Design a protein around this ligand. Structure first.
Ligand SMILES: Nc1ncnc2c1ncn2[C@@H]1O[C@H](COP(=O)(O)OP(=O)(O)OP(=O)(O)O)[C@@H](O)[C@H]1O
Ligand SMILES: [Mg+2]
Length: 451
């Protein structure tokens, strides 16, 4: 008996939003130790919806100073007297215990832990909770591994674990390698699987693609675009194509019609958020409908790819976070899609990395548009480098099917414009400029005028 409800509403990973909870009760309690319980917690709302959260509880007979406020769940009477319940993920000892269960591929009641074959886990390293993790909780062990424990849990195959396992077991070097994972059932033994967490190799001394890109795009008096970041963009193209190739081989390819009705529905929705889109909607729709009946090759893909999802280690680019298109239901997130849509995601990301500078300047600071010109030249150079690097591995330039590529770029820009109109009005000119540019790029490709 803990006041779970009173505690959970204050957590940044809690997704109850503005809603009234009816109850918050443990569906399953699994003892891991005398002073350690694993809890599946069901939160029920007034509409009858239930959301399940994973909690690990460390009990103490006396307050431990090491724990903060958000780690303090509540209190309860136990068999030896009063006890305090803490969030065990903030306990180094408890986190280590979980890692040890993974290492041993332990089974505890309906909890199944598995270590990836041949993997080594850093059981000796100091565990430190990551402040960077927002929606889940990540514990970093020294510089060797990261334990990610899912907060909200849902039934079915987890694509992040799934695709990382495929890539690691195939020996693809462009991932932060999956070392282990754990899961349980949704409604007791014999029912749907429920992913609970994952352990991955930690890429020490790494840089985020977004940070490297923006640093390059901000270099002062860089009117002649540099080859050093073009070199990196090429290598990133190599990496994305290699990941796609491994996924295609393992999980197959198929053909589908280009999804005209899906992207039209997204356009219609977007135009309601951003009135500025109405003036472009007819032209966008024209381009989409020209792809009606166009067969496209699809496969398993990353699904949410941009420069924030790639890490540069001293040796390689890695892709991380394969959970899929955010806001989409699971079955949708495991659907195959065009590799060109992933490529489009990176191209959108280059555009933002370069043009973020401009929206943050006063008009007087670029009156003649020469900084805007440089941004354009920078995006062009690094986009070309990325596609060339992709091509070197894929043996097919993603620009060859230019109409399909440009359509996916357009759909992302339309979606971006609706986001900026609502949440960041001063950023809206970035996707609006892209839309006018891409409409021409797409128009040209449809006529086979692209190189
Ligand atoms: N395997 C890893 N090695 C190093 N850094 C990582 C690794 N995985 C994620 N990160 C970093 O953790 C941050 C949060 O990513 P999240 O887990 O929320 O998805 C990101 O900024 C990313 O750079
Ligand atoms: Mg991410």
């Amino acid at each position: 008996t803990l006041a779970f409800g009173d505690w959970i509403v204050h957590r940044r990973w809690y997704a109850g939003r503005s809603r009234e909870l009816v109850s918050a009760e443990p569906a399953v309690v699994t003892p891991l130790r005398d002073d350690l319980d694993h809890i599946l917690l069901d939160v029920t709302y007034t509409d009858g919806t239930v959301e399940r959260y994973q909690l690990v509880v460390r009990w103490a007979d006396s307050p431990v100073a090491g724990f903060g406020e958000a780690a303090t769940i509540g209190t309860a009477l136990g068999p030896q007297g009063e006890r305090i319940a803490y969030d065990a993920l903030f306990d180094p000892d408890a986190a280590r215990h979980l890692l040890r269960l993974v290492d041993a591929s332990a089974t505890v009641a309906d909890l199944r832990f598995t270590r990836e074959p041949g993997a080594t886990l850093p059981l000796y390293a100091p565990p430190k909770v990551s402040s960077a993790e927002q929606s889940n909780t990540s514990v970093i062990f020294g510089k060797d591994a990261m334990l990610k424990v899912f907060r909200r849990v849902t039934p079915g195959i987890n694509p992040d674990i799934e695709l990382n396992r495929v890539l690691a077991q195939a020996g693809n070097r462009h991932v932060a390698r999956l070392l282990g994972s754990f899961e349980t059932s949704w409604a007791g033994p014999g029912t749907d699987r429920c992913a609970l967490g994952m352990v991955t190799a930690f890429a020490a001394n790494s840089a985020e693609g977004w940070d490297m890109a923006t640093a390059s795009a901000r270099e002062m008096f860089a009117d002649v675009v540099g080859s050093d970041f073009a070199d990196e963009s090429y290598r990133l193209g190599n990496a994305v194509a290699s990941v796609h190739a491994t996924l295609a081989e393992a999980l197959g390819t198929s053909t589908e019609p280009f999804p005209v009705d899906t992207v039209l529905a997204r356009l219609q929705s977007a135009a309601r958020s951003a009135p500025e889109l109405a003036g472009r909607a007819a032209a966008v729709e024209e381009r989409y409908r020209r792809l009606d009946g166009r067969a496209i090759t699809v496969q398993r893909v990353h699904g949410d790819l941009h420069l924030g999802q790639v890490l540069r280690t001293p040796d390689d680019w890695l892709l991380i976070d394969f959970e899929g298109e955010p806001g989409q239901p699971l079955d949708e997130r495991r659907r195959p899609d065009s590799p060109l849509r992933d490529v489009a995601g990176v191209l959108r990301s280059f555009e933002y990395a370069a043009y973020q500078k401009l929206v943050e300047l006063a008009p007087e600071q670029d009156a003649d548009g020469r900084l805007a010109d440089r941004a354009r030249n920078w995006v062009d150079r690094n986009s070309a480098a990325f596609c060339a690097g992709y091509a070197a591995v894929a043996g097919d330039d993603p620009r060859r099917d230019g109409d399909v590529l440009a359509a996916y770029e357009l759909d992302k820009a339309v979606y971006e414009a609706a986001y900026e109109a609502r949440f960041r009005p001063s950023w809206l000119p970035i996707p609006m400029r892209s839309i006018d540019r891409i409409l021409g790029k797409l128009a040209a490709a449809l006529e086979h005028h692209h190189h």
